[PDB]
């Protein structure tokens, strides 16, 4: 009931979704392996390492 | 100068102004600027030429 007063459309999002606890990785066509590797690949590797 | 036309052989009505002027060839030649592309190499990331 109190979510539209936070001006969020509850069909397009929920307030629980602003905190990420799972994280999509982009496909290989978005980060080309011969640029060697793209910066997003390194940052994702470091996130896996810190996990 | 009184100047005769080379095409018709008849002289010209107005006089023509001859003299040696120092022209200098600049580096912008058309053989270095003519360019075309049908289809060729594209970028890897954004697949456009």
Report d(CA B8, CA B3) in Å as an integer. Answer: 12
- Rounded to the nearest angstrom, the minimum Cα separation between B28 and chain A is 34
C-alpha closest to that of B12 among B4, B1, B20:
B4
Nearest chain A residue to B47 by CA distance is: A29
B25 is in an annotated binding site: no
Nearest chain B residue to A34 by CA distance is: B44
Tell me the resolution in Å: 3.3
Sign of the CA dihedral running A12, A15, A21, A25: positive
Q: What angle do CA A30, A32, A37 make, to 5 degrees?
A: 125
Between the CA of residue B10 and those of B14, B19, B29, what are the distances in Å? 12, 22, 37
**Interchain contact A18–B (C-beta under 8 A):** no
Q: What percentage of chain B's residues is helix, strand, coil (to nearest 5)?
A: 10, 5, 90
A26-31: long-range pairs with CB below 8 Å, 24+? none
Cβ neighbours of A37 (radius 10 Å): 13
């Amino acid at each position: 009931e109190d979510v539209p007063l936070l001006l969020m459309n509850p069909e397009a999002g929920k307030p629980s979704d602003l905190i990420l606890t799972r994280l999509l990785v982009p496909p290989l066509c978005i980060r080309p392996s011969v640029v060697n590797e793209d910066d997003l690949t390194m940052k994702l590797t470091e996130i896996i390492f810190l996990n | 100068d009184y100047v005769t036309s080379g095409i018709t052989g008849e002289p010209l009505e107005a006089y023509i102004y001859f003299g040696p002027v120092y022209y200098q060839k600049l580096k912008h030649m058309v053989l270095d600027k003519m360019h075309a592309r049908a289809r060729g190499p594209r970028a890897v990331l954004t697949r456009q030429p």
